[PDB]
Design an enzyme around this catalytic site. Structure first.
Site, PDB file in Angstrom:
ATOM      1  N   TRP A 155     -46.271  49.515  91.214  1.00 50.66           N
ATOM      2  CA  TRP A 155     -46.665  49.585  92.596  1.00 50.66           C
ATOM      3  C   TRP A 155     -46.191  50.907  93.151  1.00 50.66           C
ATOM      4  CZ3 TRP A 155     -44.032  47.103  97.436  1.00 50.66           C
ATOM      5  CH2 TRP A 155     -44.755  47.502  98.574  1.00 50.66           C
ATOM      6  N   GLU A 204     -41.668  65.200  94.096  1.00 50.28           N
ATOM      7  CA  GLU A 204     -42.374  65.082  92.827  1.00 50.28           C
ATOM      8  C   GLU A 204     -43.775  64.557  92.921  1.00 50.28           C
ATOM      9  OE1 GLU A 204     -39.850  63.605  89.636  1.00 50.28           O
ATOM     10  OE2 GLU A 204     -38.263  64.979  90.561  1.00 50.28           O
ATOM     11  N   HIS A 249     -40.844  64.610  86.856  1.00 50.06           N
ATOM     12  CA  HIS A 249     -42.216  65.078  86.741  1.00 50.06           C
ATOM     13  C   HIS A 249     -42.342  66.543  87.102  1.00 50.06           C
ATOM     14  CE1 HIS A 249     -41.716  60.946  88.123  1.00 50.06           C
ATOM     15  NE2 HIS A 249     -42.710  60.623  87.308  1.00 50.06           N
ATOM     16  N   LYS A 286     -38.006  58.576  81.458  1.00 50.35           N
ATOM     17  CA  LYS A 286     -39.444  58.874  81.526  1.00 50.35           C
ATOM     18  C   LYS A 286     -39.686  60.268  82.056  1.00 50.35           C
ATOM     19  CE  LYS A 286     -43.441  58.356  84.548  1.00 50.35           C
ATOM     20  NZ  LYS A 286     -43.705  58.202  86.004  1.00 50.35           N
ATOM     21  N   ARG A 320     -50.853  60.773  75.385  1.00 53.15           N
ATOM     22  CA  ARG A 320     -50.939  59.443  75.944  1.00 53.15           C
ATOM     23  C   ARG A 320     -51.323  58.448  74.908  1.00 53.15           C
ATOM     24  NH1 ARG A 320     -50.717  59.816  81.496  1.00 53.15           N
ATOM     25  NH2 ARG A 320     -51.400  61.740  82.475  1.00 53.15           N
ATOM     26  N   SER A 356     -54.785  57.902  88.233  1.00 52.74           N
ATOM     27  CA  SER A 356     -53.713  58.122  89.208  1.00 52.74           C
ATOM     28  C   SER A 356     -52.887  59.400  88.934  1.00 52.74           C
ATOM     29  CB  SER A 356     -52.768  56.907  89.343  1.00 52.74           C
ATOM     30  OG  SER A 356     -51.972  56.587  88.198  1.00 52.74           O
ATOM     31  N   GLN A 376     -55.204  60.623  82.594  1.00 52.68           N
ATOM     32  CA  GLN A 376     -55.289  59.195  82.291  1.00 52.68           C
ATOM     33  C   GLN A 376     -56.763  58.824  81.920  1.00 52.68           C
ATOM     34  OE1 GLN A 376     -54.042  57.180  85.712  1.00 52.68           O
ATOM     35  NE2 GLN A 376     -51.881  57.615  85.490  1.00 52.68           N
TER      36      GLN A 376
END
Ligand code: NI
Lengths: 260, 266
Positions: free
Chosen positions: B61, B100, B157, B184, B227, B246, B250
Site C-alpha cells: 500500500w 525518494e 532508491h 531492498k 526483475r 508503478s 515493471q
C-alpha cells in the site's frame, strides 16, 4: 544464396532473416547419424518454432564421405525450405561428438560451401588463423556467411580475454563472432554479459552471439536484446548443450522481453 | 520505552528466509509485489477490491498517494479497509518519502509516527522504512516493529543513476546492521553496464554478507532482466504491474509470473 551484411546497422540478413535487428533469433541443432535419421529429424523440426536450423554434422556417421554429406544436406534443404541452414561440424573438444584432422575439416566445409545447399558455415577460431581466414574468404566468394566460434565447457575467461577473442573473430572476417563459456560461479555469468556489452558497443560492426552455459547461465540465453547477443539456442526434443530451454519457452520469454 | 503487559512472522537466518502469512520469501522462485495507490479512502477500497483478482504474492500500500496521510487514525481506517479485503496475503505499508520519489513529503517525526501507528494497528504485516531516514530513528522503529511481530523491508532508491557496486553493497549491509528483515534497493541504469553493476552487487551481497533475503532491481526497460533473474542472482522478490506500472520497467504480473515459472523449472 546471396546474403546481406550491413556494417552500419550491425546486421546480417540470410533468407530474409535479419540477424542483429529486434528480438534475438532462435537456433536449433539437428542431429542425425544416417541420411534417413536426418530426414526424420527434419520432418519433426519442421513443426517447431525456430529461426535458423543448425545441422550438427559431427553427429553424422559418414562425415568423410562427400556424397553422403551432400545427400543429407539436400534432404534437409528439401524439407526445411524457408529457414537459413547453418552447417556446423563441432569438434569434440569444443562440445561436439567427433574430431577430424584440420585438412578433413577444411574439405568438409569446402564441400558444404560448394554445394549451394547451406546458407552459413561455422568455423572454429582455434582451427588455426591462416586456415580460418582463407576459409572465410572462400565462403564469402560463394555467398555463404560465417559464424566463427569458440567454446569453453569448463570455465569463463576474464571479460578482457572474451572481448579480445570476439575482436579477433571479427578481424578474421567472421560475419557473426560467437562465444560460449561455462560459469563456475554466479559472477561468471555476469562476466560473460559484461564482455558481450563491451564488444557489442565498443568494437562490433556486426552481430555477435554469446552465452553462458548451464542452468546458472540461462539468463544469458534470454537477455540478448538488451545486452547485445543476436541469437540464442533452444531445444526441440533434447538439449544439445547445458542450459538450453525448450524452443517454446525460449520464444515466450524473448517475446515478453521484446514487448515489455 | 515501549512496554507490553506481562501478526506473526518467521525468519530463518540459516535458510535466509522471512515467512509472512505462509509466504516464504527467500525460497524458490521470487515473489511478486504489486503496489496499490488511492487518493481517498473510496479509491483505496475500489483498488483493493479490483486487485484481489490479480496474481500477486505481497500487496504494498503506497501510503504516499493517500491525501489524508496527516491524521494517523484516517490512514488506519484505509489500512483496515485493505486488510478486510485482502485477507490472505502479506500487506506492506509503504510511505515512499518525497526524498525518494514519493508523491509526498512529511517531516521525519510525522513519518515515524505514521509507521508507529501502522505497527500499533495490527492491520499490516510489514512496514517499509527508508535507510536514509536517520540511524537513531530507524533503529528505534525497527525495534518497535519487531516488538509487535511486524517485519521491516528497509529501502533505498535512486531514480537517476546506479551507484558503484561497492556502494550498493554497503547500503544493503547497513540495512542488515540496522535490523532490516529484508534489505531492498532500486537503482536506475544510465548504461547497459549499470544493469550488470546492480546484479554484481546483488550476487556479492547475497553470497558474502546476507543472512536474510534481499530485494534488488535495476529500473527502466533496460533493467527489466533484473526483475526476472532473482532466483539465480539472489533477489527474493520483484514488482509487477496489475493495471499500470508503478515504477519504470515493471511488466504485467501475468508476464512476470510466466517468466519466473519458466526460470524455476527443473
Ligand atoms: Ni505496543
Amino acid at each position: 544464396n546471396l546474403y546481406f551484411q550491413s556494417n552500419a546497422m550491425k546486421t546480417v540478413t540470410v533468407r530474409d532473416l535479419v540477424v542483429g535487428e529486434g528480438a534475438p533469433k532462435i537456433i536449433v541443432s539437428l542431429m542425425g547419424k544416417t541420411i534417413t535419421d536426418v530426414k526424420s529429424e527434419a520432418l519433426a523440426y519442421r513443426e517447431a518454432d525456430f529461426d535458423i536450423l543448425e545441422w550438427r554434422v559431427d553427429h553424422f556417421a559418414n562425415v568423410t564421405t562427400a556424397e553422403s554429406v551432400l545427400e543429407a544436406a539436400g534432404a534437409i534443404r528439401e524439407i526445411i525450405t524457408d529457414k537459413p541452414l547453418l552447417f556446423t561440424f563441432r569438434s569434440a573438444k569444443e562440445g561436439g561428438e567427433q574430431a577430424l584432422t584440420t585438412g578433413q575439416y577444411i574439405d568438409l566445409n569446402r564441400a558444404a560451401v560448394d554445394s549451394g545447399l547451406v546458407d552459413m558455415i561455422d568455423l572454429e577460431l582455434f582451427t588455426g588463423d591462416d586456415e580460418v581466414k582463407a576459409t572465410v574468404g572462400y565462403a564469402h566468394q560463394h555467398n555463404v556467411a560465417v559464424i566463427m566460434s569458440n567454446h569453453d565447457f569448463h570455465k569463463t575467461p576474464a571479460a578482457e580475454e572474451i572481448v579480445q577473442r570476439l575482436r579477433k573473430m571479427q578481424e578474421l572476417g567472421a560475419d557473426i563472432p560467437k562465444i560460449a563459456v561455462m560459469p563456475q560461479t554466479k559472477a561468471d555469468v555476469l562476466t560473460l554479459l559484461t564482455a558481450t556489452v563491451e564488444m557489442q558497443e565498443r568494437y562490433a560492426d556486426r552481430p555477435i552471439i554469446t552465452m553462458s552455459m548451464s542452468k546458472t547461465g540461462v539468463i544469458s540465453r534470454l537477455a540478448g536484446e538488451v545486452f547485445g547477443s543476436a541469437a540464442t539456442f533452444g531445444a526441440v526434443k533434447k538439449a544439445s548443450a547445458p542450459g538450453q530451454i525448450s524452443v517454446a519457452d525460449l520464444r515466450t520469454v524473448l517475446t515478453i522481453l521484446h514487448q515489455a
